[PDB]
Amino acid sequence: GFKQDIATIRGDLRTYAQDIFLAFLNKYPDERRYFKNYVGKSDQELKSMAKFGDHTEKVFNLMMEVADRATDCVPLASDANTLVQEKQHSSLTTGNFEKLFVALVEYMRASGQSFDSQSWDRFGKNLVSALSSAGMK
Numbered sequence: 001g002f003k004q005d006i007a008t009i010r011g012d013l014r015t016y017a018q019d020i021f022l023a024f025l026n027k028y029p030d031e032r033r034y035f036k037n038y039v040g041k042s043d044q045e046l047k048s049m050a051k052f053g054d055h056t057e058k059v060f061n062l063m064m065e066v067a068d069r070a071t072d073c074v075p076l077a078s079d080a081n082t083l084v085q086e087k088q089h090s091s092l093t094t095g096n097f098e099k100l101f102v103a104l105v106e107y108m109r110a111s112g113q114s115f116d117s118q119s120w121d122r123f124g125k126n127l128v129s130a131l132s133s134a135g136m137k
């Protein structure tokens, strides 16, 4: 279930974070523009870069914190507020986050691993809702 999936992801966080983030960028290539350092680079070029792995690890660490702190896949308002108030998130709308969870759910369903993809879909939905409540346009 959802709780186990957090453990699955955390067990190999760097690998899953890079794979899912790439799945996001590749499904929605318009989103790559937000990430100047990643423009014009293949998956393998990005995986070779320590900074790319470090960035994706930090993002997915926090996502996993928000997921673990949630009750029944409903995230805490304070966590949504953190995400809205991140300086690097200033120009973003909830659609950016919606896209990320579409790609994440797609990745889980395509994977050989037994992810609770429906729970991640619900979690994504509830997070988008919470981002809006915290003031994200």
Ligand code: HEM
Residues within 6 Å of the ligand: 031, 034, 035, 054, 055, 058, 059, 060, 062, 063, 083, 086, 088, 089, 092, 096, 097, 100
């Ligand atoms: C739940 C999902 C997300 C989480 C937990 C998250 C979290 C974070 C964190 C912790 C950082 C700082 C890490 C660092 O300095 O490298 C960061 C940076 C950033 N985030 Fe997110 N983020 C999420 C989704 C998104 C989305 C969907 C976008 C837009 C497509 C986005 C755009 C950015 C950008 C542009 C930066 C700065 C990257 C850079 O200049 O190196 N984030 N995010």
Ligand SMILES: [C-]#N
Residues within 6 Å of the ligand: 059
């Ligand atoms: C945020 N990536």
